Write a protein that binds this DNA or RNA. Sequence first.
DNA 1: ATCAATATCCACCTGCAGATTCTACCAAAAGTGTATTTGGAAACTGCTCCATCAAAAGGCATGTTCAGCTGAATTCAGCTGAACATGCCTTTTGATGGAGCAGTTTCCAAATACACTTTTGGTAGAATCTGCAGGTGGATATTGAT
DNA 2: TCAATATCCACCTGCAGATTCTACCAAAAGTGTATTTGGAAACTGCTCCATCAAAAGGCATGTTCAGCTGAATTCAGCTGAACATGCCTTTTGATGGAGCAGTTTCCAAATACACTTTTGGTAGAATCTGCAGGTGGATATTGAT
Lengths: 86, 77, 90, 92, 108, 105, 99, 96
Amino acid sequence: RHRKVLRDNIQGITKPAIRRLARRGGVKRISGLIYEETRGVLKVFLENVIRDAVTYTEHAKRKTVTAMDVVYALKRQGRTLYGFGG
Amino acid sequence: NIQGITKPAIRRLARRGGVKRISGLIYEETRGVLKVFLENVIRDAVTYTEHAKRKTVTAMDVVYALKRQGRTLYGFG
Amino acid sequence: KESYSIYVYKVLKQVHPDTGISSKAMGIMNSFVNDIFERIAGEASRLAHYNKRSTITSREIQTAVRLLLPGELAKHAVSEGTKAVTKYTS
Amino acid sequence: SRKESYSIYVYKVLKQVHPDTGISSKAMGIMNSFVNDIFERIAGEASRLAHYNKRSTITSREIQTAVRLLLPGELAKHAVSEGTKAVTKYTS
Amino acid sequence: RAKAKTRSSRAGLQFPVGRVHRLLRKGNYSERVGAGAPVYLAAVLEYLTAEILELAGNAARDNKKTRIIPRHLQLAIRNDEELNKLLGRVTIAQGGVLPNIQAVLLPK
Amino acid sequence: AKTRSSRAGLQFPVGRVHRLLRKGNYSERVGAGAPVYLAAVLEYLTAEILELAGNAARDNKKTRIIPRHLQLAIRNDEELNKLLGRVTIAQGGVLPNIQAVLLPK
Amino acid sequence: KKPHRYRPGTVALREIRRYQKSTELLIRKLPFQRLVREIAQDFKTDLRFQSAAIGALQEASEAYLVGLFEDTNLCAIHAKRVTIMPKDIQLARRIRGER
Amino acid sequence: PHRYRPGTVALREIRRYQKSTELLIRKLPFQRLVREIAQDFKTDLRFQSAAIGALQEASEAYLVGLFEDTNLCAIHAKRVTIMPKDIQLARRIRGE
DNA sequence: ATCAATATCCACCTGCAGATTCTACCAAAAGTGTATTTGGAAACTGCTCCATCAAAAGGCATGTTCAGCTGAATTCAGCTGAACATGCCTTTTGATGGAGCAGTTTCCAAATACACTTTTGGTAGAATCTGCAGGTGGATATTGAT
DNA sequence: TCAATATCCACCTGCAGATTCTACCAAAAGTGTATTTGGAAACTGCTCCATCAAAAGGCATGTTCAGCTGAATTCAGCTGAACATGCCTTTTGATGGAGCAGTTTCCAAATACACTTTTGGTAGAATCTGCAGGTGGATATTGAT
Ligand SMILES: [Cl-]
Ligand SMILES: [Cl-]
Ligand SMILES: [Cl-]
Ligand SMILES: [Cl-]
Ligand SMILES: [Mn+2]
Ligand SMILES: [Mn+2]
Ligand SMILES: [Mn+2]
Ligand SMILES: [Mn+2]
Ligand SMILES: [Mn+2]
Ligand SMILES: [Mn+2]
Ligand SMILES: [Mn+2]
Ligand SMILES: [Mn+2]
Ligand SMILES: [Mn+2]
Ligand SMILES: [Mn+2]
Ligand SMILES: [Mn+2]
Ligand SMILES: [Mn+2]
Ligand SMILES: [Mn+2]
């Protein structure tokens, strides 16, 4: 009826995934401490967007986070996103 | 007129920015930067000025231009 | 020309009875008040539009405050707003 | 539950500039996002322009000034040309 | 009551002047809206759309492709200085990035 | 005779805020509680900034708050600093701050 | 014959070219989904999500991290290094006004 | 006779100018530069004195912040001396 | 002055999931006609700024000396990349059940609309008091010689 | 650690001048009524969303090991800091006047809405079609000979 508790999922952002992202960002060589650092940064990022998104969701008296809520959060954070207005 | 922004003025600005030691090539570089900045603000400012059918750039025109560059300025309203 | 000068001065006298303020600093306070007014009103406007509501109420103001203000400032501002509305309503 | 979008107009324009070229649904979504974004930027700036000058009416002049503020250089000049020509033709 | 002619047709545009006008009216931008404002705005939006579709189509043909995808839009925008400026704070979903390797990283 | 601000326990003008909301092209209608709430928030923020700035002014042995005091107050407060992260305060200068590596020995 | 072995860097460069050429998401879908739902669960409970909402979050997050890595790379190279370190990320984010 | 070692007077100056708030660029050359640049956009312009003052506060605040970031770049490269390279890095990361 | 040993392009092929075209209803423009606003063209007026003149002070340009910082050159020890085997868990596709959006109707609490009367905030001189311009002297730091 | 300097930093006082106080008066806000209306409550029709299931293979993880990077060090050339001189640019203070803003009045022109038709835009349905992968052979590049 309900899913298993979500715990420590930030570790799901694996070393090779972060390596791939860095590759797209043009990085050739990566210090070992980078990955944890990245996990921190991403975490913060998500917390900031999702927070606002949920705020919008709560303002609309909904229980479902929509793509538009996310888009609005990103926009007000100066992170304008194209492609999900549909 | 860009040379009117002298070396010691730039040194003063850098000092306020916490800079202890300054390369000789900095000043010209700085001037370029300054020029660009001004060109960006003044442009927009003047645009506002011309929309108002005026010939005098007001403090508010500047404030609106800065605001629209995300360089919000307090104290000239 | 209107400004918030007299209200800023009243508040100043509340928090520091024997303290004054320069003209420039008052100009900066006026800039501040107008700025935050625009941020909050703008966000509340967008909130109202997104939800197809034609009326900006205290609820939009509150949500906008939660979006715009950081942490403790948000909590306290929200408290003051709700408190003021409650008192006004009474 | 009907939804409006700029899709057909974007497609007409596409057929104007590239007669033998199509476009994915996702890319169309990005184009719709784009049009709505620029709409809000221009309309917002024009609103502020009208307010600053104590005017209750947004006219083509507010739109033009907003275009000049928001768009860079040649893009702005060309956009201005398109707008002005469209208004002059429309009135006639 | 004559035969109807659309504002877009009169203005010589593809983009909907009537729709743009309605959106201006209900967008709470001003108390009144001039007749020329939605024409101008529709024209500008149409033009910008045209420039981006032009460049993106070019990019699509460069990849021996007949359908424009988000990648083509990204290539078009980022390889164009002024579009890049206009959309400097915009993320194109599924656009990826421009190929670019820092010279110092290449073998010596 | 009674003002709305008096009723709300505020110093900031509820009537003015309401009017500015109505004519600000924000919405077709404006609720009765909205300007009360907004005025309260603005007053609160003003109070916080004037509190800290007044402290700085007293620390500088001055009875009048100047822009410098406002800058010091805002930048030395984490949340006020974030709130005004993209704002320039004229004649505010900057916080005294020298990078440790630049110091002697 | 000792078996073949590319020198350190060659495969890295190869990977850079590969991933700069493509546009697919680089984080695994399901774990990202879990992370988002976890974080969101910490603000409001029993939330649901449109799939497009999570997709939007992932596109945004990956674009953000990629750009960050570009700037980080520039910071490392500036210091005459080829290896990005936490210092580089911190400098990039400080200059961005993120910290 | 006396001589402070290279760096001491620099530091002292840093404390002095970080303590104060006065404009650091001379008024007239700034005015001249502004009017010159402005002539290239729109002609026969005039300026309120407060407009020019606003431009100068903004310009100097911008330059100071830029120099902070520039300094951070130089220190990052294990230097104490800012170079055009540092400014360019700072401006690139700023998205300027 | 090359061979193996890999990875990368480049063309070709075809089915289907995704795109495009087709159909036909109807929401929303368009046409039309009154009711309200408003844009400025003509005609004034107090002021801001610009132009010009002028003295003088302090800020800057310049030349000299040298301390120390930046960059090159060198050395080495771990760290991070490359490669490979294991097996986990993500991805894919679909089922199942229902929580929770939307769509529609209904009807008041709340908001807008006028017509007037109070109350208040902006403005500019008077009155009031505080920084500040310099100067002193004691604290604090710096420098070079030991 | 030390005499021998140079520079801050607090504190002082005489007043010029910013700030606060006052009082007049349009212009907002308040007020007394009178009418509307947005949206919240209340069913309810159905999308999508949540969770689970199977299976297959793609990818994460751990391991080994050595190349090459980052860090640490050495040293001196030449750059940038500090300081003294003396010239000139900027600062500061006036004067004169015209060239902009800012304002009123009044109608022609532009806009606002409501009513009444028409038609372009939409949602599926019916069609069309790139291109994703799948196969495989040339070409490029790499690292050790
Ligand atoms: Cl118009
Ligand atoms: Cl309300
Ligand atoms: Cl580090
Ligand atoms: Cl350099
Ligand atoms: Mn939790
Ligand atoms: Mn109907
Ligand atoms: Mn009535
Ligand atoms: Mn009455
Ligand atoms: Mn009063
Ligand atoms: Mn005193
Ligand atoms: Mn003094
Ligand atoms: Mn009725
Ligand atoms: Mn209704
Ligand atoms: Mn090295
Ligand atoms: Mn030497
Ligand atoms: Mn038809
Ligand atoms: Mn293929």
